[PDB]
């Protein structure tokens, strides 16, 4: 559990404009800029050089402080790789060029339920797991609007709060007993033991099982 996370997902805002029935959203608003600043300071103290995204289960382009937050990543963690995951409904050409200049290296746009292109990827939405490994808690930290740290993007209900960055350094949370044993337990495939993982049907995302098939 020594290796730092390679991706951190930050819920800079919790609302999304869509109502996708397949999404946890169906069925506060924005992250305190002070809270985002202490996260930047912590990530800066680690010389963080992995990926950073701005979407948990909300639409980042709805965040009124998005430009500020993106600009701060370039100041605090210029080695990191800022990525926007967005439904695209707010992504005008102007926002795109502005966000790119501020530091975003990639936009992953997903046309969802309803209704710079080198840096734009366009997608369109369109039991026995008890022993499966999973490497997500070894690679990914999630930070919610209120600062809670989760081991996975699946934990919408925050069953596995590892700590809170408003109260503790994210490196210390990442390396605490609870997070360390969890990622070890999931690396060994003990999904059945976790209330988060035991019913999870992730088979392709950071699993040994992923080399097979298709
Ligand atoms: S656009 Fe994405 S985050 Fe928003 S409701 Fe749909 S699936 Fe959920
Ligand atoms: S098994 Fe599922 S819920 Fe558990 S850490 Fe992996 S992806 Fe997340």
From Swiss-Prot:
Cofactor remark: Binds 2 [4Fe-4S] clusters. One cluster is coordinated with 3 cysteines and an exchangeable S-adenosyl-L-methionine. A second auxiliary cluster is also in contact with the substrate and is proposed to facilitate the loss of the second electron in the oxidation.
Enzyme class: oxidoreductase
Gene3D superfamilies registered for this protein in UniProt: Aldolase class I
Cofactor(s) recorded in Swiss-Prot or TrEMBL: [4Fe-4S] cluster
GO BP term, example: antibiotic biosynthetic process
Binding residues for [4Fe-4S] cluster 1: 16, 20, 23
EC number: 1.1.99.38
Organism: Niallia circulans (Bacillus circulans)
Outcome, altering residue 63 to A: Soluble protein
Catalytic activity: 2-deoxy-scyllo-inosamine + S-adenosyl-L-methionine = 3-amino-2,3-dideoxy-scyllo-inosose + 5'-deoxyadenosine + L-methionine + H(+)
Keyword terms: 4Fe-4S, Antibiotic biosynthesis, Iron, Iron-sulfur, Metal-binding, Oxidoreductase, S-adenosyl-L-methionine
Protein family per UniProt: Belongs to the radical SAM superfamily.
Designated name of the protein: S-adenosyl-L-methionine-dependent 2-deoxy-scyllo-inosamine dehydrogenase
InterPro entries attached to this UniProt entry: 4Fe4S-binding_SPASM_dom, Aldolase_TIM, BtrN-like, rSAM
